[PDB]
Each structure stands twice: as C-alpha cells, then as structure tokens.
Backbone:
RNA sequence: UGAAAUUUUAGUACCUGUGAAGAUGCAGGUUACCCGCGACAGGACGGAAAGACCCCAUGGAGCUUUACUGUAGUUUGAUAU
RNA sequence: GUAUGAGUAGCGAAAGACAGGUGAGAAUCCUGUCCACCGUAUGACUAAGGUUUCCUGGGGAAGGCUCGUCCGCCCAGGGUUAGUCGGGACCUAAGCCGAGGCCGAUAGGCGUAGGCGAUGGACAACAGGUUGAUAUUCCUGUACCAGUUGUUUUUGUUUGAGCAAUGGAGGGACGCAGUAGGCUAAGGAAUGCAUGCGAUUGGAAGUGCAUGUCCAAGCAAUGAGUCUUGAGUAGAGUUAAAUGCUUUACUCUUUAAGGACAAGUUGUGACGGGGAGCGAAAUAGUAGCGAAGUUCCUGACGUCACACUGCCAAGAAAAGCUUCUAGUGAGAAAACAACUGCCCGUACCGUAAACCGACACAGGUAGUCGAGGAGAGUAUCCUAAGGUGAGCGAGCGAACUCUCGUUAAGGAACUCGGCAAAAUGACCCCGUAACUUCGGGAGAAGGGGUGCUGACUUCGGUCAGCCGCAGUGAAUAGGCCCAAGCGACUGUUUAUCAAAAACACAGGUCUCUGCAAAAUCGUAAGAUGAAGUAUAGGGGCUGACGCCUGCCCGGUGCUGGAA
RNA sequence: CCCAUGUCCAGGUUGAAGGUGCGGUAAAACGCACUGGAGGACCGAACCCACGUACGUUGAAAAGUGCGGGGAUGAGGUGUG
C-alpha cells in the first residue's frame, strides 16, 4: 500500500511512498545482475540529446526474460523483488531444470505459483502463450510485436491489455492506451496485468527525491533568452506571444501530432488513442 | 583564488603530447608547421 | 652489448670509499645494463664472486659555462657487493 | 633602499574688466623681500578613460516578426529502382 | 636613451633583548641565555606539482624590497641502492584506439573482435642501527613469496600417481543511516617502580621536586566474538564430461550439530634493541655505559565490520583465487642444503620563500596523524612534542587617516534607512501566547541559579558558613517582539557592482508518443531516449497545501472532415 | 554539466514510522508508558559558500582582508581519470 509520511518537515510534508509489502527480499540474483552506466541523456557524440536526465543513484541491470520461450518445464516463483530499472516489480523464478530467471510480476502473483509457457499452458496469471491460444476478453501483458523478439508492450506497473478478437493471422488487441490494433497471432503474451498498480499514486514530495530518480531540473522556455528558446525574452513575465507554444526547436507543443504519416503500421492500427 | 593553470604531467602529454598530435591529420599539420618554422620543440 | 662495454669506469668518492671498506664497489655502467648483466660483467672481468648488485639511475645535472647552459650526461650507478671468501677488486 | 601617474617652455599673485562669451599668463589697478618645511584641497574647466548620454555614418553586431529574398528540415505528387 | 614627480610613495599582517664569536665591515651571520609566537598547527607524514632548490667547502658581482661575513643566490665537488614499498612484466570501470566491417564529395565519421586505460580489485618484511646528504632500498637480527639445482625420504609409472583448460561452476562482489557490543591504540592518576637532587626568598627529609616508567613482522598456542541449518532419496539440467555447480519434489535435522570467519591476547622472536641518565681521551656531549617499564581510571565509527538493525534512492567489472571434469601424463610430493629473482620511482620542498598566483606575493593547494587542563568538542584560552620570532630599522609620541579601549547627562533627537557599534550569548531550573497543515510556533516570551569551605547526602541535592563591585569572575557561544507585501519550503543564480519577489522544486494540467515510439545529435552509418514500453518517455504552461479556476471557438493555431 | 572510481563531513540536539507492555473493546479504533532512531531536521567547528559593513582601491591581492554572515547527511563538499 501507500504510506503517507507525517509532516515532520516541510520537505517531508505531503510526501508518500510505497510500503514494499509485496517485496519478499532485497538480495537480487547474482547470476542475472548486469552493470549499467548512467548515460545521462548523452549519445555517442557526447552531446546532450535528451534533456533533464542524469545524476541520481547507481543501479544494476536485472536481466528480465521477456521472451518466455522456455516451454519445456515449469517455473516456480521464488521471490518478488524491487527493480530499480522499471516501475513494476520483478519475480525470480526457478525452472525445474535449474535455470534461474526474472520475469515481470503480474498483479496477484504469489510465491510458489508454478508458471508455464507454451500453447498448452492453462490460462493463469503469469503463464505465457502465443496470442492465438489466448481466449478473447482475456487480460494480458508483456506483449511482443514480432515472434521470438520478446515482450515489448504493456510492461509498466499496473498496465494491461485485453484481447478483443482474431482475424487472419492477426489478433485484435486493446492496448493500455486505449488504442486498438492488430498484432501477429504468433506473438506471445503473459496472462494477467502488471503488478504494483499503486505506483502511480506516489507523491514524490521533494526535489531531492527526483534527483535520486535521475531527473534533472526542467527549465521553462518562457524564462530563457531569445537565442535559447522561441519563448525566451520579453520584459517581465510574458505570455506565449506566438501562434502556438513550441518546443525549444520550434515544434508546436499542444495538439500537434508527430506520428509519421506514412507509418507502415497504419495498416494494423484499427483505432487510435493518444 | 584558484588560477587557470593547474600543472599535471599526464594531462599535458595526453592533450598536447607528440602521439596525440600524430593521431590526427590536423595534429600532423601542426607538427609540420612547427618543423617548417624551425621550432626546437615541436610537441609537449 | 659486449660484457667489456657494460662496465664503464669506477666511482671514487667519499661514499664509494666507505663502501669499499665493506667490500662493495661502485661502477658507472651502460645506461641500458640491468643489474643481472652487471653481475655477469663484473664476474668475468675481475674473477670475483658477486653477492648482490644495487643499481640506481643518476639524473642529468644542469650546468652552465658563460652564456651556454646544458645538462651533464645521464649516468647509471651500480653498487656491487662481493661475497665473503672472495677476492677483492683492486683499483 | 627607492618607484609611479603626469609633464609645450615656464622667474607660475589678487580684484574688476576683456577675450572662443568662466584668465597665473591679456588690460587697469592693487598686493607681494629670497628659499623652504608640516598641513588643506578653491583653481589649474586638475589626472585617469579619442563620452557609454545626445546626434551623425547610405558603420557594426545580437535579437524579433504576417519586412524582402533564400534555405535545412517536414510533407505531397510524378518518375527510376 | 634620459628626465619631472623625488630623495617623495612604498620597503608586503606578528617581539625581541643583551653577551660572546666571526670578520675589512654586523640591528640583520654564528653561539649562548632570557623573553615572545603557533600548537586540528605555524607541528609530523605523505599525493600532485616543482626538478637539484638536498649535503659538504668556498664567494659576496648581480638576485634578497635595508644590511649581510648569510641564503632556496653564485662557484666546486657530492648525494637518490628494493624479489617484498608505489608502478610495469596482474585485472578490469568510465573513456579512448580499433583487423575486418558500416557509412560517407575528399579528408574522414562510426564501430565488432581485440586491446589500452586507475582514481578501484589482486598481490610476499618487519624491528632497530647507520651517513653530511639514502633507507620497509644499506647494515644487524629475524622472516616471507615465486623458482632452479642437488642430497635424502616416501609413491607412480599407461587397471595410470600427478598436472589440468581458452570450457561448466563457486568466489571475488560491493549502497545509505542508526545505535549497541568486543578488542587495541590513545589519554589520565597513583605516598606503584627506577634514577637524580634537598633547595637558601620566610617554610618543607616528606603525602618534597624533576625525569623515565617498552619493544615489531614472522612462527606457535589461543581467542572476545561473527555468520551460516545440515543430511538423505528421486528427478531435471549444466552445448561434450564432471565426483563440481544450479535446481524441482519428497523424507529427517534445525534453542542445536557441523562448517566458515575473527579483531585481539600469550609465548617465542628478545642472551636482541631502545631507554632517564652517567659520560671518555688523543678533541664531543660523541665513542661507551645504562636503572625501572606496575596497578588503577577513561577509552575510541581505529579494528571485529557494512557484523547487526532499519531504510529506499536498491547500491561496478575483470583477474587473481577454489573446484569440476575434458585433456595431459612418467614422473611426482616432502624435508634439507645451496642458489636465482628484471625495469621504473626513491634526493629535497610539499596549509609552501622550492607547487598555482609575473614577486622570497596577507590568496588557492587532495589525503593521513594531530597531545594536556577546563570542555560535548578537532570550539575556546593557556600549554606538550615540535616548530618559529616573519629580510628595513632607530627616534619622536603633532594634525589627519586607519585599527582598538573608555566616556558625564540624554538615549535614535542621527540617518534614505538604527548603517555601524552597543546590547543578547554557555550550562541547569521554572515557564512559555496568537496561529497552525497539529509537525510546529519554541531556545517564543519572561524569569531564577552558577564562586569557595564545611556537614549530610538517595550522589542530584540539600543544610550551614565564607569572600568580592561582580562567581559560564578571562576566551568562545541567539537580541527579542508586533504587523504587512512577495515567494510555500531546503535549494540555484549574473566567477569579478544585483542572492532577490528571479530560477528550480514537489504537486496540477494540457499535449505528443504503440516502439526501428515520439524527441534529439548526425549528410549517413551509428547513437541517446532505453538494454525503457503509455502507472513509460518527450514537449508547453502553472508552481507546496486549502477553497476555487467564470463567459467567448467570430479571428489565429492545432485536430478532424472530403462533396 | 555529465561519466567512472575514491574520499570527507568535530561534537551536541530533536525524537517520525515501526515495535513491546499496560489500559480499553466482542474485536477494534483509541489512550498511556517504554522502546525505536526518521529527516533536502535543529545548534555548531573543519569544509563549502559569499549577506552587511569598514578598509583596500599605482592594493599584501587584476576581486582580497578585518569584524560579523548562510549551509554544514545533502538537490552536499572534494580528489583522480
Ligand atoms: K513537500
Ligand atoms: K521500481
Ligand atoms: K520548470
Ligand atoms: K521574460
Ligand atoms: K621555442
Ligand atoms: K576657446
Ligand atoms: K586644490
Ligand atoms: K555585440
Ligand atoms: K622615472
Ligand atoms: K626626480
Ligand atoms: K657562506
Ligand atoms: K615493486
Ligand atoms: K591504485
Ligand atoms: K586439482
Ligand atoms: K606482514
Ligand atoms: K608476537
Ligand atoms: K628515499
Ligand atoms: K578533559
Ligand atoms: K585541544
Ligand atoms: K631582517
Ligand atoms: K614626531
Ligand atoms: K585625527
Ligand atoms: K541629537
Ligand atoms: K515568535
Ligand atoms: K552573588
Ligand atoms: K547561541
Ligand atoms: K523566489
Ligand atoms: K516554490
Ligand atoms: K501562493
Ligand atoms: K540568500
Ligand atoms: K535565476
Ligand atoms: K494550485
Ligand atoms: K509536465
Ligand atoms: K500558458
Ligand atoms: K511540473
Ligand atoms: K475563438
Ligand atoms: K477557431
Ligand atoms: K567582506
Ligand atoms: Mg523533461
Ligand atoms: Mg532571464
Ligand atoms: Mg528564435
Ligand atoms: Mg516571448
Ligand atoms: Mg508586463
Ligand atoms: Mg631501484
Ligand atoms: Mg565679453
Ligand atoms: Mg574673466
Ligand atoms: Mg607677460
Ligand atoms: Mg592654462
Ligand atoms: Mg579632466
Ligand atoms: Mg569622441
Ligand atoms: Mg610631494
Ligand atoms: Mg616584512
Ligand atoms: Mg582551533
Ligand atoms: Mg642548503
Ligand atoms: Mg653553503
Ligand atoms: Mg642589498
Ligand atoms: Mg603493486
Ligand atoms: Mg573507433
Ligand atoms: Mg579499417
Ligand atoms: Mg603487497
Ligand atoms: Mg633526508
Ligand atoms: Mg630559608
Ligand atoms: Mg552434454
Ligand atoms: Mg568501536
Ligand atoms: Mg625522502
Ligand atoms: Mg604565500
Ligand atoms: Mg600561546
Ligand atoms: Mg555615554
Ligand atoms: Mg552613564
Ligand atoms: Mg528622525
Ligand atoms: Mg534630522
Ligand atoms: Mg547592524
Ligand atoms: Mg566567561
Ligand atoms: Mg524562496
Ligand atoms: Mg535558502
Ligand atoms: Mg557579481
Ligand atoms: Mg553579491
Ligand atoms: Mg511562474
Ligand atoms: Mg539540515
Ligand atoms: Mg579546499
Ligand atoms: Mg557561487
Ligand atoms: Mg536553516
Ligand atoms: Mg548550521
């Protein structure tokens, strides 16, 4: 659940966090840890390409098994662990053959569940099946767009998609955004919804906490200089003073769509949203 | 009052060293120019 | 290099004479000579048995005559200690 | 022990007047023996900076936009693959 | 080049005095005595940087803000010793280079394999002595690590000991905060011990004074303690294999047992070394000699040890190393003796006169140690070890300027403005408002106590007495209150005239983005976004929280439509 | 500004969540003690910063010093690469 801190200090005032009740341990799997460096929004040229990123706490990457292509044997859920890299929690699972892996933790997952993957797996939270085998109306997550590539869609905490129907070699899906689109029927998905639904409700509370989470301050364009931002300049506070608000590089910032107009995936997107 | 020049042997060589100059075409142009001018010391 | 070329000359100073009293002799050696090579060269040249060789590099020393200024040549100094029951080097 | 800014040459008063219209230096008159030392800062339109204010130059630069003319990108069509 | 200003400004934070010596010449150089200064440093070590500035003997042209017989200066000689210390022959991070390769008017850009790259990991020696200058480097003593030869002793030679992968594994291997415990340094006291001395200024042979009051690494024995369940069965895996490792179910065990760690202690290292002090000539305090080394108190975030606990922001890699077989294999292992072990750095300065600041410059310079009294303390004052007296001085004691002390009566009348200064300041006790988001406000405010000596104390007091103008008697320590605007808050900002109401901020909202996402860097390749996936990411605006956020879609943008 | 890897923050103070005990109830909520040790928490050295003022202003200094001043476990300081 969400615990609210008493307003002992102005910084702590109105702050909330998770109790981490679901988390069963704090010792990740050594075999599955990998090193990660904080790119801080800088590409191979060393230029800042994405603003407002950098600093914050050190992290280790946990190798998640998005593919769920090990259908031979059952995987027993050993622990539910905190993952610094993603909003959702992960689950360490042991395959009966001794292979250890991490998966996303679906809502309602519990230690001891014996998950299975493959066409014949039953429709139970945490199981993985090709979309063709998942009955309509089912709630799923960790959907892959191409067979064997591994789950890409519906992975954030609390997210979920629903199977609407079949057609041809494609399966009709409503994604978490409300967009309805076709996805290749041989793509896999995990039954259920991503756990840690409460994540959205956390109140960060103070600037230092965002800095921990690797967000650097965001400076409004209206308080820059004209050579810095189209909104920059002007005496005193100023209105936008343009036809429409724009990003630092002149791209309109309200309502202007950016999806490529000749996207190949229009043929598969049935109903858009966002 | 910390001043601009903070000596450091390694940094001098890595930035202005002979091998650094030779690693790039423009660095070699500098060496050629120093030689043509006749500088006793063409590199750091 | 030739063993005869390894050792250049002795060093005669107050410190080196005190060392002789302990049966260790100081020699200037080729700057590229390692103490193992120095040991071999001393043995061949003087028929003595060497117990240990301590080598050190003498930096070039700045000097100036009149309007001109430069540096003395760099040197390599090796202190060779003979074993007991060994002949002394006579200079 | 030992600088510096400044400096056309100076044996370098006051008043009233004159004058490029605000004079140590010009006119009339007055005062004043020669050379310094310790202090003050009224003046030398004192020094420092070829005024930043103001105006001018068919000067410069940064910035803006439904100024003019272009243009990177973005997009649409024809055409080749 | 030389004047003027002008023999003028300045001679760069601070205490020196005198005697003696040296010498042509001395405030300035040496010696001595007293005095003074720093002492969480102005002491002791080190990294960088500097690069001979180190030592010895000379010199006084120039440099030194004076002088100079002297110097970090000039002249001549000399000085840096490593299997163990730091680096290389070990490992890798960020980053960099990059066979082929990708991309690209040229040049080139990018990048795989593979490498480079410490600030990190790994890794065998310490104590004392010695020189004018080096020392975990030389010497003495006592070790350890890797390896070679040889003697001896055991055991194996192809039903084969042993070694052993570039392969399978284990391990290395990691955050922050919080106290608690152990141990040792460190510190203190003693009518503990040892040595020396008896004062003349009135008193003291004693509970007087001064000084000292202990030693490695290694080896052996142990050890405060710390962590950890341990077996068996049946499977399944670990590209081949494995007795290794991972793992699934099932039994038994789990106040334990077994196992893994462990500061430190004792002994030996030590018939050695240090040590107050005594102290030689033939010329010093130097050879040399050399006593005691107890008890008690305090006690470390130094070490056990990131051990335990808690927390969210979730806290490197690789090698070394340990195992497993696969392979390889006729030699192996032990003890002993002798022997081998390369390159680079090693001087000296280093909170500075030797580094960065043009200077022998009131500035800046990472890390370690950093004592005593009072004290919470590394604050503060005075001191220990130790270091230093600041590279112009001698007079005089005017104005004026600066820095500082005091000030009758008044007490903000000053002034743009209480600017500056004054006042408050420590600890203990009593007591403490509006308002409030219930946390605060709050050290609100306003008061009281503080020294010394006895007595008694339950040890914190209390009672009694004494002294002064005054008892945190010095130093170091908040002034407070009422009210309004702005910004919620801690933060950030114009290095060098603006620290703010400006920026940020948590929160709100709008909007883009279905993943080769949008966005951005780039001609491209390739990147970031993200090894993330709509509870995510980018962009615009607003800015905690509370109550709220009205009307207008005609115009301009955006979005949709398609006759 | 950022990346990787180290390192620094004397000493005091306050007392969040949680936990235990006792009350309380059908069980609770809840109350009182104790324990516990949170915080862009408090006071304050080193450290970092630079608010006021005097002086300096051919400076000791091409940005400082004296006296005060703010932060000082963090959005922290700082070293190396
Ligand atoms: K807050
Ligand atoms: K998370
Ligand atoms: K902002
Ligand atoms: K503006
Ligand atoms: K030159
Ligand atoms: K005129
Ligand atoms: K005047
Ligand atoms: K300009
Ligand atoms: K002159
Ligand atoms: K003159
Ligand atoms: K001399
Ligand atoms: K070494
Ligand atoms: K290192
Ligand atoms: K073995
Ligand atoms: K050792
Ligand atoms: K011992
Ligand atoms: K040395
Ligand atoms: K004390
Ligand atoms: K002290
Ligand atoms: K002097
Ligand atoms: K006088
Ligand atoms: K005066
Ligand atoms: K008055
Ligand atoms: K108040
Ligand atoms: K009193
Ligand atoms: K105070
Ligand atoms: K503000
Ligand atoms: K704010
Ligand atoms: K407000
Ligand atoms: K401020
Ligand atoms: K700002
Ligand atoms: K609001
Ligand atoms: K936003
Ligand atoms: K707006
Ligand atoms: K915001
Ligand atoms: K409208
Ligand atoms: K409209
Ligand atoms: K000041
Ligand atoms: Mg952003
Ligand atoms: Mg602005
Ligand atoms: Mg613009
Ligand atoms: Mg504007
Ligand atoms: Mg306005
Ligand atoms: Mg050496
Ligand atoms: Mg006239
Ligand atoms: Mg006139
Ligand atoms: Mg005349
Ligand atoms: Mg004139
Ligand atoms: Mg003038
Ligand atoms: Mg002009
Ligand atoms: Mg004058
Ligand atoms: Mg002086
Ligand atoms: Mg102090
Ligand atoms: Mg000297
Ligand atoms: Mg000398
Ligand atoms: Mg002189
Ligand atoms: Mg090493
Ligand atoms: Mg490359
Ligand atoms: Mg090539
Ligand atoms: Mg070692
Ligand atoms: Mg020395
Ligand atoms: Mg007497
Ligand atoms: Mg196999
Ligand atoms: Mg301790
Ligand atoms: Mg040394
Ligand atoms: Mg200095
Ligand atoms: Mg003192
Ligand atoms: Mg008065
Ligand atoms: Mg009075
Ligand atoms: Mg008034
Ligand atoms: Mg008045
Ligand atoms: Mg004031
Ligand atoms: Mg006092
Ligand atoms: Mg503010
Ligand atoms: Mg503030
Ligand atoms: Mg400024
Ligand atoms: Mg300011
Ligand atoms: Mg605003
Ligand atoms: Mg604080
Ligand atoms: Mg500093
Ligand atoms: Mg600043
Ligand atoms: Mg504060
Ligand atoms: Mg403070």
Residues:
């Amino acid at each position: 659940a969400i615990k609210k801190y008493k307003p002992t200090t102005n910084g702590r005032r109105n702050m909330t966090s998770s109790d981490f009740a679901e988390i069963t341990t704090s010792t990740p799997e050594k075999s599955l840890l990998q090193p990660l460096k904080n790119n801080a929004g800088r590409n191979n040229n060393g230029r800042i390409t994405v603003r407002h990123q950098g600093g914050g706490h050190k992290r280790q990457y946990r190798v998640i098994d998005f593919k769920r292509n090990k259908d031979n044997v059952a995987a027993v859920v050993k622990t539910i662990e905190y993952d610094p890299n993603r909003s959702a929690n992960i689950a360490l699972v042991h395959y009966e053959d001794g292979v250890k892996a991490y998966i996303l933790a679906p809502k309602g997952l519990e230690v001891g569940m014996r998950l299975v993957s493959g066409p014949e797996a039953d429709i139970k939270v945490g199981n993985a099946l090709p979309l063709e085998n998942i009955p309509v109306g089912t709630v799923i997550h960790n959907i892959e767009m191409k067979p064997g590539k591994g789950g890409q869609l519906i992975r954030s905490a609390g997210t979920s998609a629903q199977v609407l129907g079949k057609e041809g070699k494609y399966v009709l899906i409503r994604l978490n955004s409300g967009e309805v689109r076709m996805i290749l029927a041989t793509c896999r998905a995990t039954i259920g919804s991503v756990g840690n639904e409460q994540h959205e409700l956390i109140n960060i509370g103070k600037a230092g906490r965002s800095r921990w989470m690797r967000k650097r301050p965001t400076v409004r364009g209206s308080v820059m200089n004209p050579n810095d931002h189209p909104h920059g300049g002007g005496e005193g506070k100023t209105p936008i003073g343009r036809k429409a608000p724009v990003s630092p590089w002149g791209q309109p910032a309200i309502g202007y769509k950016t999806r490529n107009k000749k996207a190949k995936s229009d043929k598969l997107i049935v109903r858009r949203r966002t | 009052m910390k001043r601009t020049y903070q000596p450091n042997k390694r940094k001098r060589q890595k930035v202005h060293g002979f091998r650094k100059r030779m690693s790039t075409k423009n660095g070699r142009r500098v060496l050629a120019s120093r030689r043509r001018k006749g500088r006793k010391v063409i590199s750091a | 290099m030739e063993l005869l070329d390894v050792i250049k000359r002795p060093v005669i100073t107050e410190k080196s004479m005190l060392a002789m009293d302990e049966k260790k002799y100081t020699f200037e050696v080729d700057t590229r000579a390692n103490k193992t090579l120095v040991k071999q060269a001393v043995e061949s040249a003087f028929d003595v048995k060497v117990a240990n060789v301590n080598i050190l590099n003498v930096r070039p020393k700045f000097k100036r005559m009149g309007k001109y200024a430069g540096y003395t040549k760099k040197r390599r100094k090796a202190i060779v200690t003979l074993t007991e029951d060994s002949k002394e080097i006579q200079l």
The longest helix of chain C spans residues 35-46.
